[PDB]
From a paper:
Here we report a functional and structural genomics effort that applied saturation-level transposon mutagenesis and next generation sequencing (Tn-seq) to identify essential genes in B. thailandensis, followed by high-throughput structure determination. We used an “ortholog rescue” approach to maximize structural coverage of these gene families, which are likely to be essential not only in B. thailandensis, but also in related, but more virulent, Burkholderia species, such as B. pseudomallei. Using only seven Burkholderia species to select orthologs of essential genes, we solved structures for 49/406 essential gene families, and for 56 total Burkholderia protein targets (including seven ortholog replicates). Of these 56 targets, 25 satisfied criteria for being a potential antimicrobial drug target.
By using an ortholog rescue strategy for insoluble or difficult to crystallize targets, we increased our structural coverage of B. thailandensis essential genes from 31/406 (7.6%) to 49/406 (12.1%).
Residue numbers in the entry: 4 to 151, 159 to 210, 227 to 311
The structure:
Amino acid sequence: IDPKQFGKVAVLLGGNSAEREVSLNSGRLVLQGLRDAGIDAHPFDPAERPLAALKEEGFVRAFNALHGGYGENGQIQGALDFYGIRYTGSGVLGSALGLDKFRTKLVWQQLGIPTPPFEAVLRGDDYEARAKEIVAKLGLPLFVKPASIKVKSADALPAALIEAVKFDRIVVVEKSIEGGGEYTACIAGNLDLPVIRIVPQYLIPCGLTADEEARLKVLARRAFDVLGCTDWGRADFMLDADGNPYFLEVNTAPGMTDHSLPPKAARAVGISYQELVVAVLALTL
């Protein structure tokens, strides 16, 4: 790909979210890789510059290296769509739905994409009542995940429901999957990237058979695509003790630091950092 085909590129980085510092780190490295590949790239921090400057300064496309908040929830995607600026990763629906664990899991359940069973808790519920019904119906341990804390005993759940409804009007109480591990499949166009095991480090080889890895990647890519997400991201999943997968969530704005997942997945099969960034930007052509 001739670098001049990309035109003038903005690397979106920084922003106003809690994850600002990680985004600066991603962005600085994406910018450098693009510039090393000959691409006319420039940083653009939307916490500090007005979004209209993109059109006014002739930027034709953006590599989005923002994390969290408006960088990942469809807001900046919508605003860029409106200004005619192409960008990496998922459009408005994919991004909005991808950050919404509740609706992601409803879509999955209805389309047969396996995902851990769960109950919803809503700001204003009888917290003490629900806890009782939820532990009875689902078991322990549970995870309390605000839609947009691990709980191991029944009487600890109320306090966690009270606390988690402070962060979202909708709280997903999810059954924990035991005995298999946590994994992630990085998605970057048609690049064939290996499954990574996540140890709460990132572990390659993930320790599954090549056949299992191959079928889980197809399934992962489907879990991602059915939400409207396209081109670039991750799908996280648990395996139970027999190797049955359960998808947890997707990520539509993955880290691009030197210690982030996709660079580690890429390097493991001989794809350099620079090649990864160029290929992900290439999808916007």
